[PDB]
Amino acid sequence: PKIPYPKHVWSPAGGWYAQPANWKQNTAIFGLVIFGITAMVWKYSAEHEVRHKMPEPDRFYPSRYWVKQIKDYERAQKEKQ
Amino acid sequence: RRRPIEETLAEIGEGRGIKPPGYYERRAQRLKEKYGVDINPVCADPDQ
Amino acid sequence: MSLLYVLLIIPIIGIFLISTIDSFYFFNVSYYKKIALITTILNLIVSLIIYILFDFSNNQFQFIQENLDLSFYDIYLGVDGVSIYFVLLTTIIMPIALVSNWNSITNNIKSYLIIMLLLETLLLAVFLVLDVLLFYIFFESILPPLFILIGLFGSSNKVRASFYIFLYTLLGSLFLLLSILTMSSIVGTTYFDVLLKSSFEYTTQLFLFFGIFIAFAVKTPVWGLNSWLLRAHVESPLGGSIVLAAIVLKLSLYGVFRLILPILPQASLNLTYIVYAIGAITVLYASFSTLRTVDVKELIAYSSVAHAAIYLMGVFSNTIQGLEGAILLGLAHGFVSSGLFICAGGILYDRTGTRLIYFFRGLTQIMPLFSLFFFILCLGNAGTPLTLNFVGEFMSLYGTLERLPIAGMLASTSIIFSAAYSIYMYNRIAFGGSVSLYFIDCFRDLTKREFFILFTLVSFTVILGIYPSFVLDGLHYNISSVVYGIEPNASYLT
Amino acid sequence: QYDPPTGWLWGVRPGEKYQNEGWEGPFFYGFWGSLIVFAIAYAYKPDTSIQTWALEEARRRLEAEGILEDPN
Amino acid sequence: KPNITGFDMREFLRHTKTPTYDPWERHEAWRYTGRFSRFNRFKGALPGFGIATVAFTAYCVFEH
Amino acid sequence: MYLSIIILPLLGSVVSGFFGRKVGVSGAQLITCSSVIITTILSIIAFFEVGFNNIPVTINIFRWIDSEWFIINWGFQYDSLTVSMLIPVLIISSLVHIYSISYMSSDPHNQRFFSYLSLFTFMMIILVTANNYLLMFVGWEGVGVCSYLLVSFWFTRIAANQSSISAFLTNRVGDCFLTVGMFAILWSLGNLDYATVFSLAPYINSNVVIIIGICLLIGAMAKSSQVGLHVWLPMAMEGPTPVSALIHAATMVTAGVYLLMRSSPLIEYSSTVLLLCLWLGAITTVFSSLIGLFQQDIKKVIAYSTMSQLGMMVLSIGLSSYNIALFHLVNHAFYKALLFLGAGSVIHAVADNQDFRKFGGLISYLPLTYSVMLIASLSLVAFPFMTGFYSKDFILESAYGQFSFSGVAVYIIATIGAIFTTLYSVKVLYLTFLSNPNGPRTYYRLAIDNFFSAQAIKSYKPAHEGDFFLTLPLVILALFSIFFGFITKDIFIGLGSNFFVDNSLFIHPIHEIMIDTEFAVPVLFKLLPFIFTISFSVIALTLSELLSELVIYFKFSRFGYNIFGFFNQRFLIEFFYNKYITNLILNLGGQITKILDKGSIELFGPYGLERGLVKLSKNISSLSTSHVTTYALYILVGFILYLIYNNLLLDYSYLLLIIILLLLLMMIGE
Amino acid sequence: PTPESEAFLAKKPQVPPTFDGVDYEDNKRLKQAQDAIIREQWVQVMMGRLVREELSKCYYREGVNHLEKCGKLRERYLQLLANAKVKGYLFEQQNYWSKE
Amino acid sequence: GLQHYKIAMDPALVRLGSMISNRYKYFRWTKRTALVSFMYVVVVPSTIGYLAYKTDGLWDLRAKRRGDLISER
Amino acid sequence: VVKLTYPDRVSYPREFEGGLERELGGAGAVRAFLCLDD
Ligand SMILES: CCCCCCCCCCCCO[C@@H]1O[C@H](CO)[C@@H](O[C@H]2O[C@H](CO)[C@@H](O)[C@H](O)[C@H]2O)[C@H](O)[C@H]1O
Ligand SMILES: CCCCCCCCCCCCO[C@@H]1O[C@H](CO)[C@@H](O[C@H]2O[C@H](CO)[C@@H](O)[C@H](O)[C@H]2O)[C@H](O)[C@H]1O
Ligand SMILES: CCCCCCCCCCCCO[C@@H]1O[C@H](CO)[C@@H](O[C@H]2O[C@H](CO)[C@@H](O)[C@H](O)[C@H]2O)[C@H](O)[C@H]1O
Ligand SMILES: CCCCCCCCCCCCO[C@@H]1O[C@H](CO)[C@@H](O[C@H]2O[C@H](CO)[C@@H](O)[C@H](O)[C@H]2O)[C@H](O)[C@H]1O
């Protein structure tokens, strides 16, 4: 049984049992605004992460695909003989 | 406006952030006379 | 004319307009309120213009006007990086002070607005004047309009409360007057630039200290002496309480960077152990009795005593860190104490008409938005990281410890006991059961006015707590001229 | 099964609307607007901090020593 | 000397056993019988032990 | 990526908390859960990336506190120790969210609950990824706020309010000492970045390490609930069960231990702090094993079992084998969180009842719960070849491995802790599943036998098992509780393993014991905990079931009535703190308020001066009578005194005595 | 060395950081003396900041081997930590001290 | 000023607050009140001040290494 | 009772060549065992 509650109370987190009908549309919109903020934070990390050791050419290290310091090293290392 | 350094030291005393030139060598003496321990801080650098 | 006089004249122009509009019309009181609020917006606009043009590492007073017409008492207005943020706090606070108390005054509305517009002038002055006798003049001109702000718009015990602040603040300020008068007679002036050059003899400085400290212990206030604050900061109207705690309490915090640190250094150094003992005691005795207070507004007032002790111990550390932490904790208390008087004296007392904590319980169930802001404000009062209050306490306590390690360790008890009073009050009012049974009918949650002044004040506390360098960059160079000391290999260079 | 969302925001019942008291006008345009304009201008304000100055010299003193590398 | 109440610990502890006759005997009969007999009680205290033990013996003989 | 791990749990919390209206209960649950799920994969990747390649990651974003010599950055450093901490933190957060989709399904306020869960995860990330001690302190305080917000989630229960104040202020006590210790580092070294503190520690004054070490120890034990500041961990079980699973027994308690493992390249330079950590750890293992044996609540037992394992980890730190405690730490969060989730299922399956006395049978009704919970108890007791066997029993043998008195003592002491651990773990599995039914009959009525005629459609409630969101964690957590010890026992234990070679766990070559613990210990002490566990388990089952009369003779002996109530009452510690410490402070506050503020301060001040002066002036104005004859005499009297004064050349002091003596006579009436 | 920035000319002290032979009633000279002592103390403490930043990179670069490879940086940083504090000018303004 | 919402003002609790606000009018100098008024105001702060006097500049942790002493005096 | 009867150590402190004095912070640091007393 659901608790009785006053219906005049406004709460940013819904209050009691609050689910809107349009919640899937609101949820989807919030997903993109999150995914956009995370994308800005990822491009920040890629360009500001600092490593003093460099990954081996053959071992799994997916950071090699987005981090400038590493990618600039392997591009320079891809120049010899 | 200015006073002889010795004059101010009498009222306040050397120490409490007032470290007049030569405070460390004097402190060496003061600690040796009281504690009886020779001060010899570590180099903290393996070369020279 | 100088741009620092424009800060003074605007509230003066605003008082004139409030008194001369009814002559162009039985005009509404709503139009009285709009004029006073617009005219405090302009001061804030100007004050930010002054801050953009400030020079963060200049050792000369800035925005000065060359007078060259000497008299006996001449206003000299200069801004310095140690005084700029006190001015900015004043000009941000006074619009919220007006908006907070927008529907609660109900009578003598013109007189109420004219006092606050008068107060903003006098409190702006006290940070802007370049003399220590000029400083005293404005530091004590705020006294008559505050006697009337409490007796006209105050609560039940308003008459005794207005006598207490006036007479205590008058008495304590007259021991500061005797010491200022001695300094002027010896030096010939009280203009800052001529005093800071001059070095007083140790015995004279030991007797000027007894006189500037009697005043500031009366105006901090320390525990033995705070009986005026527990009356005045409570019986006063909401707008009175915001100015009294955020701004008036800081007149002596900024008055130690001018009156003690640069001109009486040997006294400050040799007597610090007496200050620290007093400060440690008021961190304990005030914390112990803030637990047992049954008046919500009085509980907030008592919290200010414990906070002020931490900044007083910081300004007496002879360290660059405790000095900046003292200014930051002065600013931090300004925003946070303001919000908790808005919660105590301006929302519960608006809805319940009582301040007794026995009638409140479980206000989260019907006012969720009040609870959210009340908890954030309560955590800043508890000195929690991410707020500007935490930074001010961390740096204040550090310098207290580096200077005299035992008193800093007793001052650090605050960390435990500030948290205990703040959470206990919050838990009793918002949480702590269900909506209380003394509430016969339901209570509405925050209005759009109440939301946006709490939101504004809370926002200042967080963003300044994340990036305090907004205020630290101005302080570093100017604060670096109130430290007293030398190091053996860095001093007396050739 | 979830209930519908509800509440009177600002105490405004679903029929009518929030009546403007007076403060809203200057507080939203003047008070806050002054802070946004202050924030926008604060970006272009030159940095006169003592540290930005002390860093540039202190780098040059360390650069003479092997402690910091000199580009030249 | 015994108390004015007839209670005593020694007789209290001696009676701490399954009573021969109980006015509530039928009402409480369920907790100790059927699904709740001792065999079914610990029938599944070790769930996979039976399946694993025979399976492991298959592994052992596989090597030889 | 690394700075995205930090940000995702924060972002989901904002949507759920200040935007729960817009997304709804389901919208919040998906965003909160999925955002934390995403962070978990990013951190699984970061483990292979940082640890398995020995590539520490640095990032610095901006200044936090910039005063001269004090520059604290909003900066993060990913190293070998960091990525070890994240894996339990993020998986247990990820699974507890999924668990909570069904546990809190009937609660009115889900958007607030799931928000606090995301907020809690953000703060542990901040705690373990900071560059400096001060940003570490943001998460340290942050998780403290998040704990208070979740032990008090049902803020209408006064019990919950009391336990949240207790969680808050007991943790704020260790905050004071941790801040005092942080002021020692700034005073001694000018900065509090980790790299600075550890690069400089070997040369620092030995007595200064003993100040920093004893402050970082006192603060650590407040969060890790060691023998002294531990009163709050039991009380945290007021908040919902999934909070107890993540925060109060798998992640927040860990921050106390992580502070010592992080500060290892510093506190190894004091034997005092290590010989203090050692005993503080051993006292708590027995202090909390005895208490849990005597509790009637499932969660109070499992909370006191958390405390015993925490005491083992600090034992390992004082033993100076840091990598061992980092192993027990990661391992414990798997089989501990499994118990709470498992015991969370049994509480939900009945009536939200929590008492052991009213649970029985329920092994048939809850088949999965018993197995998974016995998966956990076998590793909690460190049954051979469980995830606990590779961590818990290595501390015991490494304790004896350090051939000193203190090492042998804590072996004996912790061994007793082991035997009482096995004892209350039998108490849990026997009472709730293997016992005679003890609760009401509705817990047990099936539909096979027909007990109803006109209401057979409803009114059964035969303690059903939970749904998918309830069981999928338990089964996954149990799969960890089996294989995880063996699979990582080389990363952490090894013999000469170089996982922590970035100085994340610096052990001083004057302390190491691995070689001795590998070879010196005899087989008897190497194997002894297995014998005790296999001996007292069958004994305990026999006493609890076969011979169900001995224990009551003990309880109703007077000697046993007292020993029972000494432990059930938690060593009387709460009673003494609440009466002697807490209530002393309230009466001190009352004495200052009543006797001084409203008393002697006002009697010796404004109210005293008011009362005296008004009486004084009434008397003086009683002189003024408008009688010219009396006025003339007064003028002549005042004339004579002037002539006497300025002709006898009397001492000026003689005058003031008269003047002051006169004023007092006007104070006196009649 | 690094070229001296344009912003590093308006704030560069023109005077030796002392008070010897400085008339106090000449305010501009006295204020510039004060400013010259403040900036030397600040450059000294920012020199430590930069060495500490190098030490940090050396620490994370060498890992276990930090105890042998970063000692020169350790020595410089530990010298600045006792030689440099920002102590102000107020003591030096009000006292004259000489080598003799 | 503004009319507030209806409160079941408790006759008991109102007079309890009216007791506290007026409490100081009845404080007397007894042997008990002097003892508390002497310990809190004199003894405890004098005791704190004495420790603050005797430990002033006694210890410095700044830059001190092994072989050096924390004590400055 | 543990103090009265607890074992003597069985392993001699491991000898390091040179004390690893260069790998622990020079002479101004605590160094491992090297041809000393027991
Ligand atoms: C050094 C002196 C002390 C410093 C502090 C100075 C405080 C000055 C207060 C403001 C001046 C007096 O303020 C004055 O209040 C009276 C109250 O009767 C107002 O007078 C009016 O009040 C109400 C307002 O609705 C009218 O209905 C009434 O008919 C009329 O008398 C004036 O419009 C206002 O200007
Ligand atoms: C260091 C010691 C402190 C330094 C100086 C401090 C002096 C402060 C003491 C002022 C005493 C209070 O001053 C006096 O208080 C009483 C109330 O109590 C006021 O009396 C007033 O309040 C009462 C309340 O019932 C009403 O009858 C009426 O409004 C009025 O008579 C007087 O108007 C005021 O003259
Ligand atoms: C932390 C310390 C704060 C100190 C604040 C400043 C103190 C001011 C000094 C004088 C204060 C007045 O001091 C006070 O004098 C009045 C008389 O005037 C006395 O008042 C009373 O005295 C006796 C009781 O002792 C009564 O019987 C008498 O009826 C009454 O006059 C108080 O007992 C005394 O304490
Ligand atoms: C966070 C703030 C920290 C700073 C404030 C507290 C600092 C405490 C520093 C204590 C150590 C100071 O320096 C310390 O002086 C004490 C004085 O008894 C000495 O202590 C020793 O004294 C005698 C010899 O006189 C010894 O026989 C005795 O075993 C021991 O007590 C230490 O050998 C010395 O190292």
Q: Which atom of ligand 1 is nearest to the CA of C18?
A: 35
Please state, in angstroms and rounded to a whole number, the distance separating the CA atoms of residues F509 and F498. 15
Which residue owns the Cα nearest ligand 2 atom 31?
A: C159
Sign (positive/negative) of CA torsion D26, D28, D29, D34? positive
- Would you say C309 and C411 are in contact if contact means Cβ atoms under 8 Å apart? yes
Among C455, D69, I26, H68, residue whose Cα is nearest residue F207 = H68
F17: CB partners within 8 A, 6+ apart: A12, A13, F111, F112, F115, F116, F119
């004023």: which residue's tokens?
Answer: F663
What's the Cα-to-Cα distance from C200 to each of B19, C205, C209, C285, G91, rounded to whole Å? Answer: 21, 6, 11, 36, 13
CB contact under 8 A, B16 and C487: no
Q: Helix (H, G, I), strand (E, B), or coil: what is residue C486?
A: strand
For residue C196, give how far its alpha carbon lies from the nearest alpha carbon of chain G (Å).
9
Of the candidates F13, F241, F274, the one whose C-alpha atom is nearest the C-alpha of residue F126 is: F13
Residue C75 structure tokens: 């206003």
- Resolution stated for this PDB structure, in Å: 2.8
| Ligand of minimum distance to the alpha carbon of C15 | 1
Give the residue whose CA is nearest to atom 6 of ligand 4.
Answer: H59
Helix or strand or coil: residue F204?
Answer: strand
Contacts of C221 (CB under 8 A, 6+ apart): C228, C229, C305, C308
Report the distance separating Cα F111 and Cα F117, nearest Å: 10
* Whole-Å CA distances, C404 to C274, E20, F175, F465: 11, 79, 21, 63
Closest-CA distance of chain H to residue C61, Å: 34
- Scanning every residue of chain G, which has its alpha carbon at the shortest distance from the alpha carbon of D55? G46
Cβ-contact G75, B43 below 8 angstroms: yes
- Do A45 and F2 contact (CB within 8 A), yes or no? yes
- CA–CA separation, F375 and F383 (whole Å): 10
Q: Which is nearest to F240 in space by CA: F139, F158, F149, F118?
A: F149
Residue of A3, A5, A10 to mutate when probing chain C, most C C-beta within 10 A: A10
**CA nearest to G59 within chain A:** A52
CA-proximal residue: ligand 1, atom 28 (nearest): C108
User: Token pair for residue D4?
Assistant: 């519908």
CB A52 within 8 A of CB F56: yes
List the residue whose alpha carbon is closest to atom 35 of ligand 4: H69
- Give me G21's structure tokens: 């032979």
Task: Say how far residue C18 (Cα) sits from the centre of its chain.
Answer: 27
Euclidean distance between CA atoms F410 and F396, whole angstroms:
8
Q: Which helix (H) or strand (E) holds F651?
A: none
Where does residue C73 fall: left (phi above 0), alpha (psi -120 to 50 degrees), or beta otherwise? Answer: beta
Beta strand ranges found along C6-55 (DSSP E): none
Residues of B engaging G, defined by a Cβ cutoff of 8 Å: 1-5, 8, 17-18, 20-21, 43-47
Q: Beta partners for F66?
A: F71
Comparing alpha-carbon positions, the chain A residue that sits nearest to F55 is A53
* Token pair of I19 as six digits: 């004390």
Ligand 1 within 6 A of CB of C111: yes
> With 0-12 CB in 10 A as exposed, 13-18 as middle and 19+ as buried, what is A21?
exposed
* CA F414 to chain CA centroid, nearest Å: 21
**Ligand 4 centroid to residue F184 C-alpha, Å:** 16
- H69 alpha carbon, closest ligand: 4
Side-chain-side CA neighbours of residue F485 (13 Å): 29
C154 lines ligand 1 (CB under 6 A): no
Ligand 2 site, residue F565, Cβ cutoff 6 A = no
Nearest to C119 by CA among C228, C267, C272, C251: C251
Within 10 angstroms of residue F493's Cβ, the number of other Cβ atoms is 20
Q: Cα separations (Å) of C106 from C33, C101, H3?
A: 11, 10, 11
DSSP H or E segment with residue C143: helix C143-153
Distance CA F57, CA A51 (A): 5
User: Whose structure tokens read 């090297």?
Assistant: I34
**Phi, psi angle pair for F160, to nearest 5°:** -60, -40
Residue contacts between B and H (CB atoms, under 8 Å) = 25
Please count the other Cβ atoms lying within 10 Å of the Cβ belonging to residue F486.
13
Instruction: Evaluate whether G54 touches H36 at the Cβ level (below 8 Å).
Output: no
Q: Given 3-state DSSP classes, what are the helix, strand and coil percentages for chain I, each rounded to the nearest 5? A: 10, 0, 90
First vs last Cα of chain C: how many Å apart?
44
Residue D63: what are its φ and ψ, rounded to 5°?
-60, -35
Inter-helix orientation angle C320-343/C238-246, to 10°: 170
C494, two tokens: 């050739």
HEC readout, chain C: CCHHHHHHHHHHHHHHHHHCCHHHCCCCCHHHHHHHHHHHHHHHHHHHHHHHCCCCCCCCCECCCCCCCCCCCCCCECECCCCHHHHHHHHHHHHHHHHHCCCCCCCCHHHHHHHHHHHHHHHHHHHHECEHHHHHHHHCCCHHHHHHHHHHHCCCCHHHHHHHHHHHHHHHHHHHHHHHHHHHHHHCCCEHHHHHHCCCCHHHHHHHHHHHHHHHHHHCCCHHHCCCHHHHHHHCCHHHHHHHHHCHHHHHHHCHHHHCCCCCHHHHHHCHHHHHHHHHHHHHHHHHHHHCCCEHHHHHHHHHHHHHHHHHHHCCCCCHHHHHHHHHHHHHHHHHHHHHHHHHHHHHHHHCCCCEHHHCCCCCCCCHHHHHHHHHHHHHHCCCCCCHHHHHHHHHHHHHHHHCHHHHHHHCHHHHHHHHHHHHHHHHHCCCCCCCCCECCCCCCCCHHHHHHHHHHHHHHHHHHHCCHHHHHHHHHHHCCCCCCECCCCCCCC
Residue type, C349: Y
> From ligand 3's centre to the CA of F547, what distance in Å?
77
Helix (H, G, I), strand (E, B) or coil at F297: strand
**Pair of tokens at residue C457:** 């004040």
Q: Which contiguous run of DSSP H or E holds residue F62?
A: strand F57-67
Nearest-5° angle of CA F281, CA F282, CA F285? 90
Q: Does I34 touch chain F (CB under 8 A)?
A: no
Amino acid at F80: S
**What are residue D70's phi and psi, to 5 degrees?**
-95, 130
- Among F194, F189, F181, residue whose Cα is nearest residue F205: F189
Q: How far is CA C193 from CA C55, C189, F272, in A?
A: 19, 10, 54
**Contact list, G65 vs chain I (CB under 8 Å):** 23
Name residue F71's beta-bridge partners.
Answer: F66
- φ/ψ of residue B4, rounded to 5: -70, 135
Interface test with C, best of H3, H5, H41, H70 (most C CBs within 10 A): H5
Q: Among the atoms of ligand 3, which is closest to the Cα of residue F613?
A: 18
Tally of residues, chain D: 72
Taking a C-beta distance cutoff of 8 angstroms, is the pair H60, C401 a contact?
Answer: no
Contact D50 C102 (CB under 8 A): no
Report the separation in Å between the CA atom of C167 and the middle of ligand 2, taken as the mean of its atom positions: 10
The chain F residue lying nearest C362, using CA atoms, is F156
Please enumerate in sequence order all residues whose Cβ is within 8 A of that of B48, keeping only pairs 6 or more positions apart, or say none: none
* Radius of gyration, alpha carbons of chain D: 27
**Whole-angstrom Cα distance, residue F375 to residue G80?**
58
| Euclidean distance between CA atoms B2 and C198, whole angstroms | 8
Any chain D CB within 8 A of the CB of C448?
yes
Say whether residue I12 is in contact with chain F using an 8 A CB cutoff: no
- Our measurement of the distance from residue F49's CA atom to the centroid of its chain's CA atoms, rounded to an integer in Å, reads 31
Give yes or no for residue C119 CB within 6 A of ligand 1.
Answer: no
Q: Do G78 and H62 touch (CB under 8 A)?
A: no
CA atoms within 13 A on the CB side of F159: 7
Name the β-bridge partners of C79: C62
CA of D18 vs chain A CAs: smallest distance (Å)? 15
The C-alpha of H66 sits at a distance from chain G's nearest C-alpha, in angstroms, of 13
From the alpha carbon of C115, which atom of ligand 1 is closest? Answer: 7
Cross-chain residue pair C368–A6, CB shorter than 8 Å: no
Torsion of CA C407, C410, C411, C416, to 10 degrees: 170
In sequence order, what are the beta bridge partners of G96?
B4
Q: Both tokens of residue A80?
A: 């010899």
* Burial profile F568-584: b = 16 or more Cβ within 10 angstroms, e = fewer: eebeeeeeebeeeeeee
Q: What are the pocket residues of ligand 3 if the criterion is a CB atom closer than 6 Å to any ligand atom?
A: C 224; F 601, 603-605, 608-609, 611-612; H 29, 41
Rounded to the nearest angstrom, the minimum Cα separation between G72 and chain D is: 9
CA-proximal residue: ligand 4, atom 1 (nearest):
F184
CA angle F207, F210, F214 (to 5 degrees): 155
Residue C77, φ and ψ in degrees, nearest 5: -110, 110
| Exposed/middle/buried for residue C433 (C-beta within 10 Å: 0-12, 13-18, 19+) | middle
- Give chain G's domain count: 1
Minimal-distance CA residue of chain G relative to I22: G68
Per-residue tokens: C228: 């005026």
Phi, psi of C21 (to 5 degrees): -100, -45
C-beta C28 within 6 A of ligand 1:
no
Residue I23 contacts G, CB cutoff 8 Å: yes
Give the Å distances, CA to CA, from F81 to C83, C464, F507. 46, 32, 14
Separation of alpha carbons C321 and F145, rounded Å: 27
Residue written as tokens 């015990």?
C157
Query: Taking Cα atoms as reference points, which of C45, C168, C236, H11 lies closest to residue F601?
Result: C168
Looking at residue C86, its amino acid is F
* Residues whose CB is less than 8 angstroms from the CB of residue C112 and which lie 6 or more positions away in sequence, other chains included: C101, C105, C149, C152, C153, C237, C239
Span from the CA of C111 to the centroid of ligand 1 (angstroms)? 5
Could you list the beta-strand ranges (E) of F345-497.
none
CA distance C31 to C115: 17
Domain encompassing residue G79: 1-100
Contacts for F12-15: CB closer than 8 Å, 24+ residues apart: F12/A34, F12/F36, F12/F118, F13/F115, F13/F116, F13/F118, F13/F119, F13/F122, F15/A30, F15/A34
What DSSP designation does F78 have? Answer: E
Phi-psi region of F542 (alpha: psi -120 to 50; beta: other; left: phi over 0): alpha
> With a 6 A CB cut-off, is C145 part of the ligand 1 pocket?
yes
| Spatial CA neighbour of F353 closest among F290, F294, F432, F427 | F432
The DSSP bridge partners found for residue C321 are: none
Do β-strands B3-4 and G95-96 pair in parallel, antiparallel, or remain unpaired? parallel
Residue F295, sorted as left (phi over 0), alpha (psi -120 to 50) or beta, turns out to be beta
Question: Residue F74: its chain C contacts at CB < 8 A?
Answer: 466
G85 and C481 within 8 Å at the Cβ level: the answer is: no
DSSP letter at C77 equals: B
Distance between start and end Cα atoms, chain H: 64
- Judged on CB neighbours under 10 Å (0-12, 13-18, 19+), F649 is exposed
d(CA G82, ligand 4 centre) in Å: 21
For chain H, list the contacting chains (3+ Cβ pairs, <8 Å): B, C, F, G, I
| Residues with C-beta less than 6 Å from any ligand 4 atom | C 405; F 184, 207, 211; H 59, 61, 69-71
Helix (H) or strand (E) holding F65: strand F57-67
Specify the amino acid at residue E62. F
Chain G and chain D touch, per 3+ beta carbon pairs within 8 A? yes
